[PDB]
Paper text:
Hence, we set out to determine the crystal structures of cathepsin complexes with representative peptides of cleaved substrates.
Four additional sequences that did not match any sequence from protein analysis, as well as the sequence [name], were also included in synthesis. The latter was engineered as a hybrid of the LLKVAL and AVAEKQ peptides. The pattern IV group (binding of cleaved peptide fragments at primed and non-primed side) included structures of two peptides, [name] and RLSAKP, which were both bound along the active site cleft of [name]. [name] was designed as a hybrid containing the LLK-fragment from the LLKVAL peptide, which was cleaved and remained bound to [name] on the non-primed side, and AVAEKQ, which bound non-cleaved to the primed side. Overall, their electron densities were weak, and the fragments were refined with partial occupancies. As expected, the fragment LLK bound to the non-primed subsites S3–S1, whereas the fragment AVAEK bound to the primed subsites S1′–S5′, as resolved by the averaged kick omit map. However, in the middle there was sufficient space and density to attach the OXT atom to the Lys residue. The distance of 2.6 Å between C of Ser at P1 and N of Ala at P1′ and the continuous electron density between them resembled the [name] structure. In both structures, the MPD molecules competed with peptide binding at subsites S2 and S1′–S3′ and CL– ions at the S1 site. Peptides from patterns I and IV bound to [name] consistent with the observed protein cleavage sites, whereas the peptides from patterns II and III did not bind according to their cleavage site found in proteins.
Numbering used by the authors:
A (entry chain AA): 1 to 221
B (entry chain PAC): 449 to 453
Write the structure that this text describes.
Amino acid sequence: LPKSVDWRKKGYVTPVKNQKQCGSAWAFSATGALEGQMFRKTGKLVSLSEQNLVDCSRPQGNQGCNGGFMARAFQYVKENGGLDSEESYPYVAVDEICKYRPENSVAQDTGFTVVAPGKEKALMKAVATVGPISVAMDAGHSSFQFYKSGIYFEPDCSSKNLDHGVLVVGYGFEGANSQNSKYWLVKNSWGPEWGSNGYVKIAKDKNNHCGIATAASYPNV
Amino acid sequence: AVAEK
Ligand SMILES: [Cl-]
Ligand SMILES: [Cl-]
């Protein structure tokens, strides 16, 4: 595998978004992954609709602004036949009437692939071969809220009890040695003002820190 | 999780 990967440098990733006061990070993680795969398939980067997922995927197990799961969102896109663009179905950060329109669809999936749970080497293979990957993490910490620079490491982090969906866009290392001071490149949905332009470096191969490889998945397009 | 801005 490569010593480092950054899909932002290849055109796969949209600008940082902001979920605001709505528990919809699972929807932003899923649109991020679908945006990568649609770009790998077509050459066109198109922002996708988190609101379409928030309002329409209750049957699959999601709860809108009260929580959800990325695999359930990819299940909805498969069963539904499509997903609208952000332009056609804008984000308002509240639960609303499902307004899915097939004529405005710009994405599709046939299902999804799961990364083996707990395996940071399996997550590394998926990021290097596929594109950005949806992942769950434990973000419930003041140290994460106020993150600004450096490789994030928090003793209080759990690898099993998770509460937030994010997007792994790459991995890297500090220094000249590719085998130490490693990190995951993670895109958040708290706006570009949060963190380092909306991103965070999470410690890599430090015993699955904050749960990043516990529940990882990507859409099949 | 939420925290926005
Ligand atoms: Cl999931
Ligand atoms: Cl940056």
